[PDB]
Amino acid sequence: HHHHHLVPRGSNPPPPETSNPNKPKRQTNQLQYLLRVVLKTLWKHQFAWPFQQPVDAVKLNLPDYYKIIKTPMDMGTIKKRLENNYYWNAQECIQDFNTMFTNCYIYNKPGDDIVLMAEALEKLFLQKINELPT
Length: 134
Ligand SMILES: COc1ccc(Br)cc1S(=O)(=O)Nc1ccc2c(c1)OC(C)(C)C(=O)N2
Known about the structure:
Shape: globular
Largest sheet: none
Radius of gyration: 17 Å
CATH topology: Histone Acetyltransferase, Chain A
Helix content: 40-55%
Protein name: Bromodomain-containing protein 4
Number of strands: 0
Domain Bromo: 26-132
CATH superfamily: Bromodomain-like
CATH class: Mainly Alpha
Bound molecules: the ligand COc1ccc(Br)cc1S(=O)(=O)Nc1ccc2c(c1)OC(C)(C)C(=O)N2
Organism: Homo sapiens
Family: Belongs to the BET family.
Number of helices: 5
Site (Acetylated histone binding): 108
């Protein structure tokens, strides 16, 4: 009768790894471009801020976020992965960006502010990707 299910509480999941000693890794000119050009251009953009860290669903009062998004990804994670030389090739890093944008389009509705932000960042992303060293 007197248990009202006020605990236990929700939480954020553990964030994506940014280190893994047994993962194969390389430094490539494409991955260096991804850090110096692609990530740094997106990072400084005035629409970057919702994407600069793992989604804090507790702070943002988004209790459904990690019910819907099971492969979370953010630019904070990507930045740390690039700084730690985590990737084997450019494809792995690009796929992380694609995951981040796709999550946003899954979770939100066309025309939401967050979606307008993601769309503009995707546009910049694809512009810089078309100049990837070959
Ligand atoms: C009402 O909260 C808003 C409204 C517009 C904008 Br832009 C940002 C916010 S919020 O940062 O306070 N909350 C928020 C609300 C929803 C989203 C979100 C943030 O960003 C992630 C990437 C989690 C997302 O996909 N959707």
